[PDB]
């Protein structure tokens, strides 16, 4: 009907309808969304987080690492240390 009212009815119910289904929908798409933004977010928080745990972590690996470099380090200081103890 071309003569139907096109304006919105302000007399519609403005309150939230409690009879809406409170159960979560199983028909929601379970696949990952490729249309999500792949760019890094510049609006993230650049400040440090004091809420991070300040306590030492006991779950760190206590075993000696075999993947440490076994070759000698040429970048060590070749100069004789003047701060070595000069006493007897």
């Amino acid at each position, epitope marked *: 009907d071309p003569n139907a009212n096109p304006n919105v009815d302000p007399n519609a119910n403005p309150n939230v309808d409690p009879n809406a289904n409170p159960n979560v929908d199983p028909n929601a798409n379970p696949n990952a969304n490729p*249309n999500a933004n*792949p760019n*890094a977010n510049p609006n993230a928080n650049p400040n440090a987080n004091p809420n991070a745990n300040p306590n030492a972590n006991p779950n760190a690996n206590p075993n000696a690492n075999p993947n440490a470099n076994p070759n000698a380090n040429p970048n060590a200081n070749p100069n004789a240390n003047p701060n070595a103890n000069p006493n007897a």
Partner: antibody
Framework: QVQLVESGGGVVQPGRSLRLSCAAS????????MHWVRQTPGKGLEWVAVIWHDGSNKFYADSVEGRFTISRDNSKNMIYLQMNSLRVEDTAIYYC?????????????????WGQGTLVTVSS | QIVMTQSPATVSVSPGERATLSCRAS??????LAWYQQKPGQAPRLLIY???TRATGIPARFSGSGSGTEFTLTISSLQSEDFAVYFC????????FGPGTKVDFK
């Protein structure tokens, strides 16, 4: 000055593997997600794959799902595309495309900047 | 996903007049639709992104408009280097391209 150049193109036989590489310069590479876009004459432009900024998520097209593999190295500013189990339907020019002109949270997925493209031919 | 169609396949205009290219999607893509221009032997170039926003460096001649399932790409007064193929992409759901539209000398 954003320049994208591709390499690794050539001619391969069906059922074999080819590796395309794309070099990126002129921008912070690790802040943007890169795409591979395919152009086959007679079919039009076609999308292939996408990779997140740090490579956490990778999404491939249906026609290439399970055969192609996209990766990246933010320390070399290069984008790769491993094309395993190639078929005759994969003969096309492959472009290296960057997503978006700049960062907009609600507007992403369009290819602002394209590379010159490389040719991959599958035949015997 | 969404299949994009462009009509007409080719449009013939002489330099100086007004050229309009139409893009239609099977399902609504809201306002996520980019236009690309590809010259022979060249890679595609982003002209218009979103639904009307113009990429940096694009002259104000290229005017984009439309939303939902009916989009148009309008060229105000075509020059000689604007003869190329124009592609229509939607990035609302997946990433699909149109077949492309040719603009040629009349």
């Amino acid at each position: 000055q954003v320049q994208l150049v591709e390499s690794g193109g050539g001619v391969v036989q069906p059922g074999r593997s080819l590796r395309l590489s794309c070099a990126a310069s002129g921008f912070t590479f690790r802040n943007f997600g890169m795409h591979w876009v395919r152009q086959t004459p007679g079919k039009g432009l076609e999308w292939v794959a996408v990779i997140w900024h740090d490579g956490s998520n990778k999404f491939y097209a249906d026609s290439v799902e399970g055969r192609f593999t996209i990766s990246r190295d933010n320390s070399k500013n290069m984008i790769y595309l491993q094309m395993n189990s190639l078929r005759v339907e994969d003969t096309a020019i492959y472009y290296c495309a960057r997503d978006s002109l700049f960062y907009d949270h609600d507007n992403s997925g369009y290819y602002g900047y394209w590379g010159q493209g490389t040719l991959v031919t599958v035949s015997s | 996903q969404i299949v994009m169609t462009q009509s007409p396949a080719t449009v013939s205009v002489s330099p100086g007049e007004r050229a309009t290219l139409s893009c239609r999607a099977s399902r609504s893509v809201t306002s996520k639709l980019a236009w690309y221009q590809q010259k022979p032997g060249q890679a595609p170039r982003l002209l218009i992104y979103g639904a009307s926003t113009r990429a940096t460096g694009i002259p104000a001649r290229f005017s984009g408009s439309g939303s939902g399932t009916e989009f148009t790409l309008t060229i105000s007064s075509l020059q000689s280097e604007d003869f190329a193929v124009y592609f229509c992409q939607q990035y609302n759901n997946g990433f699909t391209f149109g077949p492309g539209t040719k603009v040629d000398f009349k």
